[PDB]
Design a protein around this ligand. Sequence first.
Ligand SMILES: CCCCCCCCCCCCCCCCCC(=O)OC[C@H](COP(=O)([O-])OCC(O)COP(=O)([O-])OC[C@@H](COC(=O)CCCCCCCCCCCCCCCCC)OC(=O)CCCCCCCCCCCCCCCCC)OC(=O)CCCCCCCCCCCCCCCCC
Lengths: 47, 35
Amino acid sequence: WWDERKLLGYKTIATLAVIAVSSGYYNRFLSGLWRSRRLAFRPFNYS
Amino acid sequence: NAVGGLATSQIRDLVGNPAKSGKPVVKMPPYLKPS
Ligand SMILES: CCCCCCCCCCCCCCCCCC(=O)OC[C@H](COP(=O)([O-])OCC(O)COP(=O)([O-])OC[C@@H](COC(=O)CCCCCCCCCCCCCCCCC)OC(=O)CCCCCCCCCCCCCCCCC)OC(=O)CCCCCCCCCCCCCCCCC
């Protein structure tokens, strides 16, 4: 199964690479909601 | 100055401007002074 194995390896790695690229983009896009959050605190009335 | 016999402005200054009571002042512990 030498040649079948090599060819299947190439094709599987290629498809997983496509999935990885797309899902990485989508993950970084979704994280933009939290990576850009801003906080503010209403100050107390100190002396 | 008198509007119909009334020194309204004077009355205003004595009646129309009550003092406003704000939030109580919180004494700051000395270890919280740094900004
Ligand atoms: C090739 C195909 C197959 C492989 C594909 C691999 C994926 C390719 C990328 C995806 C494709 C789409 C395009 C890019 C999209 C953006 C990136 C993305 O997909 O992010 C998804 C996702 C988004 O995450 P996030 O929500 O932003 O939060 C993650 C960080 O905390 C966020 O923290 P941060 O944002 O503050 O910054 C930290 C940094 C952390 O991420 C990294 O470091 C990843 C990149 C590392 C390589 C960097 C190369 C360049 C370095 C230059 C030198 C810099 C200086 C370094 C030294 C300084 C010394 C003083 O974050 C990023 O880099 C995020 C991406 C920033 C760029 C945005 C896209 C720009 C446009 C793309 C092109 C740019 C111009 C170039 C032109 C085109 C070239 C093709 O990223 C991750 O999850 C991180 C991936 C890396 C993890 C590594 C650590 C793993 C830890 C252990 C787990 C595994 C255990 C088992 C391992 C061993 C098993 C044996």
